[PDB]
Design an enzyme around this catalytic site. Structure first.
Site, PDB file in Angstrom:
ATOM      1  N   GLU A  37       0.794  -1.228   0.000  1.00  0.00           N
ATOM      2  CA  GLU A  37       0.000   0.000   0.000  1.00  0.00           C
ATOM      3  C   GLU A  37       0.822   1.272   0.000  1.00  0.00           C
ATOM      4  O   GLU A  37       0.704   2.117   0.900  1.00  0.00           O
ATOM      5  CB  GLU A  37      -1.038  -0.015   1.131  1.00  0.00           C
ATOM      6  CG  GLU A  37      -1.973  -1.198   1.013  1.00  0.00           C
ATOM      7  CD  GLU A  37      -3.190  -1.146   1.925  1.00  0.00           C
ATOM      8  OE1 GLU A  37      -3.300  -0.192   2.722  1.00  0.00           O
ATOM      9  OE2 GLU A  37      -4.033  -2.081   1.840  1.00  0.00           O
ATOM     10  N   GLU A  94      -4.486  -8.670  -0.706  1.00  0.00           N
ATOM     11  CA  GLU A  94      -4.996  -8.371   0.636  1.00  0.00           C
ATOM     12  C   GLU A  94      -6.382  -7.755   0.539  1.00  0.00           C
ATOM     13  O   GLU A  94      -6.579  -6.741  -0.143  1.00  0.00           O
ATOM     14  CB  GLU A  94      -4.117  -7.383   1.391  1.00  0.00           C
ATOM     15  CG  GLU A  94      -4.504  -7.290   2.861  1.00  0.00           C
ATOM     16  CD  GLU A  94      -3.875  -6.120   3.598  1.00  0.00           C
ATOM     17  OE1 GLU A  94      -2.638  -5.940   3.465  1.00  0.00           O
ATOM     18  OE2 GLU A  94      -4.610  -5.438   4.327  1.00  0.00           O
TER      19      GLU A  94
END
Length: 390
Positions: free
Chosen positions: A140, A229
């Protein structure tokens, strides 16, 4: 009228790599020996996961904590991928991002040192019996309030000029929401693309209309596509058995596979009160939603074209095992009504279909076989259910 779906075994889509979830033995407790078996075995009462995700700690003194679970996953047939949240602190600097001070990024003069850190992790794990399938540049990079930010440009520089030096498959960019601005530059640069092995993405707030990726379809030959994820539809405490909420997990996986062409779908924490495995070590409703895919659609099967939404509230995907042309169809009925459809599989020799059904009151229950009328199969789907046909 009866709605119809057609499964076209000759129209091959993506090869499935697998399904799994995260272990993080620094932030939370490691999986126990029993839980490792429940996660990565594919026997009765086991999830059938084949992908373990782990983190690359910024402190090498923590690396040892990963080894037992990673090795056991591999013993059970899984592959392991690793993602970093921060480089070591001596490689980081702070900066102000959109008026917020004290944010972290990798120093521009430390890109080579960061390669070495990642390679040191790969080497440590290899030395301890864990041959990593892939390692990521950054978890991220575009949602790094609590970790290390990378702009699209910074990620591109790394992928273009440094990532070829990594002694493993390289995964990038793991955008929190599959934001294409993070990945487009990689795909549009031949050297960066050559250094990429897996386009990784997270699915937090990713809508169905944002699951296709034309540029990847165009340029991604020889690259894998992994959803590395998510948790859905929330991380509420003690939510994993909520019904019909758990159907959102199945629907999200359907969408990843069919709308996104994803080859892998990886949850966040495997064991958690909102995860596929409850704290008591048993499978949750959300876990059974995953299992409808993971226990049946094995690595190496290939998704095929199939009528994806044959009637309102009913979603269908199908995969084929190329070794014997057998078929696995996963059918979600989100309606409060039963739904009867015809499933046509032209050209198949299969005539007997087994079925496993999850509802609010039963988990992967094997129901009566269905005998085909030639190459068409009529099925009544229970309300608020998932059915896997094999």
């Amino acid at each position: 009228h009866m709605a119809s779906a057609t499964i076209n075994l000759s129209a091959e889509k993506q090869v499935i790599r697998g399904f799994g979830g995260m272990n993080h033995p620094v932030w939370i407790s490691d999986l126990t020996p029993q839980q490792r078996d429940t996660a990565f075995g594919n026997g009765e009462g086991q999830l059938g996961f084949t992908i373990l995700r782990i983190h690359v700690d910024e402190n090498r003194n923590n690396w040892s904590k990963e080894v037992a679970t990673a090795r056991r996953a591999i013993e059970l047939g899984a592959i392991v991928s690793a993602s970093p949240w921060n480089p070591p602190s001596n490689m980081v600097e702070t900066f102000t991002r959109n008026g917020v001070p004290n944010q972290k990024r990798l120093r521009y003069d430390k890109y080579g040192d960061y390669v070495q850190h990642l390679n040191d992790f790969v080497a440590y794990m290899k030395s301890n019996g864990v041959d990593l399938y892939a390692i990521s540049v950054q978890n991220e990079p575009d949602y790094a309030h609590e970790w290390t930010w990378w702009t699209p440009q910074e990620m591109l520089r790394f992928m273009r000029d440094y990532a070829g030096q990594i002694n493993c498959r390289v995964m990038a960019p793991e955008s929190f929401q599959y934001l294409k601005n993070m990945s487009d530059p990689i795909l549009n640069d031949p050297q960066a693309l050559a250094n990429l092995d897996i386009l990784g993405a997270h699915f937090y707030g990713t809508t169905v209309n944002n699951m296709p990726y034309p540029l990847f379809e165009q340029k991604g030959a020889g690259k894998e596509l992994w959803m590395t994820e998510v948790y859905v539809p929330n991380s509420d405490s003690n939510s994993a058995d909520r019904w019909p909420e758990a159907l959102e997990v199945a629907h999200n996986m359907h969408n990843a596979l069919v709308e996104g062409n994803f080859q892998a779908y990886v949850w966040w924490y495997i064991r958690r009160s909102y995860g596929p495995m409850k704290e008591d070590g048993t499978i949750s409703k959300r876990g059974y939603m995953m299992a409808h895919y993971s226990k049946f659609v094995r690595p190496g099967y290939v998704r095929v074209d199939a009528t994806k939404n044959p009637t309102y509230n009913v979603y269908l995907s199908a995969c084929k095992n190329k070794k014997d042309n057998s078929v696995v169809a996963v059918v979600i009925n989100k309606s409060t009504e039963a739904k009867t459809i015809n499933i046509s599989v032209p050209g198949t020799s299969i005539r007997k279909w087994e079925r496993y059904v999850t509802t609010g009151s039963k988990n992967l229950r094997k129901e009566s076989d269905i005998n085909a009328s030639g190459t068409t199969f009529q099925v009544t789907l229970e309300p608020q259910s998932v059915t896997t046909f094999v």
